[PDB]
Structure formats: C-alpha cells, structure tokens
C-alpha cells in the first residue's frame, strides 16, 4: 500500500524527489515516530535525518563542470556549484532544520516566515517575516518538516513569489508529507521542486498526518 502510494506520487509528480528508502532511514523514522521516544533522542535522530535530507536537496541546485589538478599533477574533471542561495524557514517547525542547513553551508543566509491560520475561517495569515534583501535573486531552500494540508507552505510560496522569487528556483525540503498536501502544492506551484523523506497515508480531522509523527514542533522544541 505504501509502495503503491509511493510509486503513484512518483509517477504523478515528476518534481518530487523521494529519498532512498534505506534501512537506516527507516530506523531513524521509527525512532522519531515512536510516541515512547524521549526528547533528547528525538532531537538527536531528527537532527541526523535532517542532514541527510539537506544533502539530498542540495543536489537540486545547478552546477558547472570544473576541472582541477591533483597533487599528483594529473587533472580531475569535476563540477562546482556556483549559485546564490539561502534557506527560509517556516516558524517554528522549519526552524528545527536551519542548523542542519547551517552545518553544511557555512554562514548561509537564513530568512524566517511566521504564518498563522485564521480563527474564524482558518485562511493562513502572514504574521511576520525577515528575509534577505536580494532574495529575488536567490535559489530558495524552503524548510518545513511537515506537509499536511499544505496551507502554510502554499502561503509561504505566495509571499516568496510576490517578492520576486522565481517559482522554479524554490526547493521545498520536507521530512514527512501527505498525498493531499503534495497534490495541493503542485496544483498551485507546478514548477517548485520538493524533496521528502516519507509519504504517509492520510490526514485526520485534526489535520495531523497518519500514521504521522504528531506535532513536530512541540516534539522537537519540547513544548508539549
């Protein structure tokens, strides 16, 4: 059922890249998903998985061929990445991913976006944001560990676009998604790319993914 779900996502949305489902990745996910898991452990594994995730997403950037000479005076033909990038986190869950991104891209600029779902209805509302000034000229790693209804991420993209960010330069880095959130982002922004570690079954009336992980932000920051 998962396999089938996984494949269908894959065949339906060419712009999503699913991390290789290795045993270790599964191990990590079980620890993280487990209710029983203690906070220090949750953080430790969440952190480990995020780095792999980040490494995977970085492969979505553009690169050029570059040739160098080895200390053995022989040429090596490689490549180099030359783009202006930055990470944008959705507060506060996405914030949990900044350290990951900062670990591999020393001093990368970090923008933050705070979105709130309205009380009457629940249309997401932009509450606060601090972004790099030249963001319009950057590739964007948009960080949000969980994509359920996709309401938040779609709002974040709306603002990014409004500011001038090229839709095709947005890379959505995610840990766990629901087919429905996936469908929504692509129906609204077909050009963005999305990298995720997992696709779950459904959402509940409370809009939590299931089997899911619970409230990522509460778990990672320990504000249960």
């Amino acid at each position: 059922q998962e396999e089938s779900i996984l494949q269908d996502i894959i065949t339906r949305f060419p712009n999503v890249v699913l991390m290789k489902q290795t045993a270790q990745l599964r191990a990590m996910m079980t620890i993280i998903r487990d209710k029983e898991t203690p906070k220090e452990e949750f953080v430790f594994y969440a952190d480990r998985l995020i780095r792999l995730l980040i490494e995977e997403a970085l492969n979505e950037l553009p690169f050029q061929k570059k040739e160098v000479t080895t200390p053995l005076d022989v040429s090596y033909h490689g490549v180099s990445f030359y783009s202006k990038i930055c990470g944008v986190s959705i507060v506060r869950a996405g914030e949990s991913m900044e350290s990951g991104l900062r670990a591999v891209c020393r001093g990368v600029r970090i923008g933050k976006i705070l979105i709130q779902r309205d009380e009457t209805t629940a249309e997401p509302k932009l509450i606060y944001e601090k972004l790099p000034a030249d963001i319009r000229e950057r590739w964007v790693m948009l960080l949000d560990p969980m994509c359920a209804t996709a309401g938040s991420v779609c709002k974040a993209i709306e603002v990014l676009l409004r500011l001038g960010v090229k839709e095709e330069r947005i890379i959505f880095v995610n840990i766990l998604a629901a087919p429905q959130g996936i469908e929504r982002v692509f129906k609204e922004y077909p050009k963005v790319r999305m990298v995720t570690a997992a696709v779950d079954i459904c959402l509940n009336s409370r809009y939590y993914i299931v089997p899911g992980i619970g409230d990522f932000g509460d778990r990672y920051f320990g504000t249960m």
Copy 2:
C-alpha cells in the same frame, strides 16, 4: 572510461558498495582532490563527505523489524539495529574518520591499529594496537580513507582475524580506492564488505592513486 572501470568492479566484486555518484558527491570530491584547496576547506569538506560515507556504511549492518505506536495512537512498521559494533581506525589516516562515526553513533567503541611498512623491507608490520576486549563479538567498521595496494588494510584484517573477529563481520569503509587494491582485498578476504565513494583509474610509479588525492593523512592533519 570511469564507467567502464566501475562496471567491471561492480560486476566482479559483489561485496563492494559504491556510493551514489551525485553531483554534490562529485563537487565535494572536486574540492578535496584540488591541489589548490586550503587546509581548512580540505578538512570541512572531507568531514562532510565522511559523514555521508558513514551513513551509507551503516546500512550494511543487520536489522530486525520493529513496530511502534505513533502519537496518533496508530502503529507503524519499522526496523531497529541490534548488533554490537565498534569502529577501528588505521592510524593515522583512518583516524580522520572517527569524528564522523562518533557523530552518528554516540559513544561507539573505537579500536586503533598502527601498521607501518619496514623502511627497507617495504613490508607491513603491526606497530601498535589498542582494541576493545570483546571485539571478537562485534561488527567492525574498519576505517581507512585510501586503498592503493591494499597492503595496510590486508594486514589490519589479518590482525583482526587473529583476535577472533569474523571475516563476514568487517565492513571496510573507504573514501578512494584503486582497482588493484579492491581486487587484492577480495582475493584475500572474499567475505568482507567494502563501502567506498570513488574508484580511481590506477596507481602510479610511486604507488600513488591517480588521479588520486595526494597523501590523505598529510592533507587532513596538516603535516604536509
């Protein structure tokens, strides 16, 4: 060219695991192979790449199957790794990899083996070793960035075997290898597993891997 070589090795040596040759992997290999690269950069990147190699390697261990119940109170089908392991570094170069292993495996036991070639005789002699008392009962993550003639690694393996380690329980974790080294390892210990990030074309007159990386141990510790 490289593809040919790779195919052969992949075909003849069913126990080697080449890591996914991603653009990122390549970019990292390009910086660390560059003779112009400054030491700080050299260290940052090697570390980054080592991290990925280690993660790749851990997939070689055996795991069970484990079910957990999520906060949504539904159950999830996962896995867990239950083996006793340890890492063993070949001094000095292998040492560079210890930080990576400790990073993902808090408090993992670390054994050290200093092998040195007689200055006249050219042969490997075990100079110093300090291993965990029950190493005979664990999986050994053998660490050595480079594999040229396979002289050193072969001797390291011989000592491990004399202590009672099971051949099939050694996972040789390597960054760069020459075909001949790979071929030799397998001739002598057909049952070990080898994880590596690159396979070079050949050794040169001084038995240096080419195009190669130079002397890993010197570039990493700065005793150039």
Copy 3:
C-alpha cells in the same frame, strides 16, 4: 574608562555577572564587532563566544553536593545540579543562542517569544509565544544577545512572571549591554540575574549600542 564603567556596573548591581575579560574573549568581540567581518566568520566567532557565555550562565543554577567513587575505588566529593530548566529565546536575535544551549544541555526545552515595539507608541508588544507547559516550575535562561533600552527583555520578563515563573529563577544571558538597559532591568525586576560578556558606553538616537556591534539579528542570519 571601560574599567570605570565596568566596575561601576559591578558595584551597583550585585546581580550581574560579567564574564572574565580574557584576551581571547576580547579577540572574539573584536572579530564580531568589526563591520568588515564576513558572515561565515561572524557566525563562527559568535557561536564560539555564545558557548562560553552559556557555560558561564549555567553556574548561576543551584547544585547539591554529591559523592561518588572513582574506578580506583576511592571517593570523590562532587556537586550535582538537579534543577529543571529551559531556555526561552527572544525572536529572532535570541534564537541564535539556542544552538549553544542545546549543545551543552542535550534536548533542553526551548520556548520562544516574539515582541515588537509600536511604531508610534514604542510599547513593545507581544506578538507570539510558544513555551513549555510547566515553565512556572522551571529556571529560565532568557536569551537575547543585545540589551539596549531593555524594553524587549522587560516585556519578555513581564509575560514570564504573568505565567508564574519566579523572578529570582530567571537568568538573562546576554552578550552586549548598555548601562541604561542594565539599570532598567534591575529597576523593574531586582531579583533576576544577568550574565553578559560586555558593557558598552552608550546608546544612539536610533537605539543602537555604541561602539556596539550593529544589528546582531541581521548580522547573524544574514538579512542585512
């Protein structure tokens, strides 16, 4: 002169604790105060200094004598810390210290408070908060690298007190402070403790500490 300001602060407010002015500390502040310093560097040194600062702050917590026995089988008399704690950061500048606290206090719960002065009025207003549920029972490490007019931190303190946190259980961790900001905090909440690494001469019409460091928040997140 600095000495004079330093001493004056020190004799006037028994509750503040100034980090020891070592040359290294000063080398650090030098790097980060220099408008010439590149983001990666700034980040680098800022994190380094934050680690020390945090370690310093951690000594304000209460401890118990504890006796253990060495592997040599003789006793040692130690002094364990047994209190419950948490960090609360003032978004977004304070968030920069979060990683430091987490580095040394594995999985410490982190609360966040987002405040903003009114354009006209200048009354700092609470915009958002997410804190641990039982914060009333904890000791709190309030994090804000810069304390100028102290408006924001006094507002942050107000809400903590409203929430039930005991004033004397609040430890304000700060990098740079203005004498004026210090005086306000103590006029309003004499029972809190403050740990800073440096006291500057004054504040400007735009409310920046001088000679100061500029806007810590953009400098650190790269949104300048």
Copy 4:
C-alpha cells in the same frame, strides 16, 4: 587537603594555570570520575570540559593590539592573536583533545606522538611521530589528559626540543595532574606553560592518580 595543595603548587610553580574551579567544572568532573558513568555520558562530558580547557589554554598565546571600526562607524580597540600554532597529541589519550582543538581552531595543524614504556624496562620510548614540518617555528599545544609521573610528557617534550621547538613555546594542556607530575615537568623544563583543570592528591601504589578518574584513554575510546 586540596586547598593546601592547590595553594602550594600555585605558589611554587608560577607557570601553571588552574582553571577556575566553578561548580559546573566540579559537576563535570564528578560525572567523569564516577565509575558508574556510561560511556556516552563519559564522552559527552569529557568533550564539554575539554572544550573549556582549550579555550582557557588559548589565552597563553601572544596577542597584538588591533583597532576596528564597528558598523556604527566608530572605533573599537581590540586585540588580535597572530601566532602560528599547532596541536600535538600524545597517542592515544591526547587524541581525545584533538576535536576540541579543531572545534575552536578550524583546520589547525595536528602533530602526533606515540610514546610507550618498555614492557620490562619501563623506559618510555618514542614509537611513532608525525609532526608538521615547520613545528620549530610554531607554538605548541601539547595535549595529554593525564599527568601522573610525567614520564610520558617529559619524553614528548624532549623530542619536540630535539626538533627545534622553543621550550618557552610549549603550552602543556592537561585535564588532571598529580603534584609529583607537575614537579618533575618543572624541574626538567622550567620554561613550559601548563594549563590544567584539577590537581589530585597523589599516585597509587601502582602509579595511578587518586582519587583520579582511572585510565582516561580506555574510558574515552571504550577499550576497557
């Protein structure tokens, strides 16, 4: 008792630097000495303390005055550390201090020395060394957690001297020491500098520091 001891040493040996005996420091020491502490904790806490230790040691280096202009367009009078340095690990115990050094001094050059006492004779002998080529020009941070009889460090210093390093440029970084140890090092090389976290009572009938911590290298690498 201990207060007497510290006083004597401090008085008789103007070149030793004891870290401030803070409650936190004590707390870390209690966990590390405790024979019941698990290997992960042992490592986490030793790393933390080693980090403070190195930061302390770095103050032993020479520094220049430096003035910079802040973003407020105003001058600040700082200092700069200009010396070329390197870390020198005494294998294997000192290797545990490397990460700490590399954490604060990115890509700093790391030399290694393996000294061993003859199984029969007990004479400490140089078994293996790999040092920077220009070590004579640098300031040396000699690392070794424990200093019992000082036989090892004495030998290490001796070889450094034969290479041309100035006795005055050797900063011996140590976690724990015995009075005898300190005394000998100062009798033989009155000019080195020594930074340490604690000084214990005495040595065992078997030359172990008491109350001590036991065999640090075994406890840290997990080969006990």
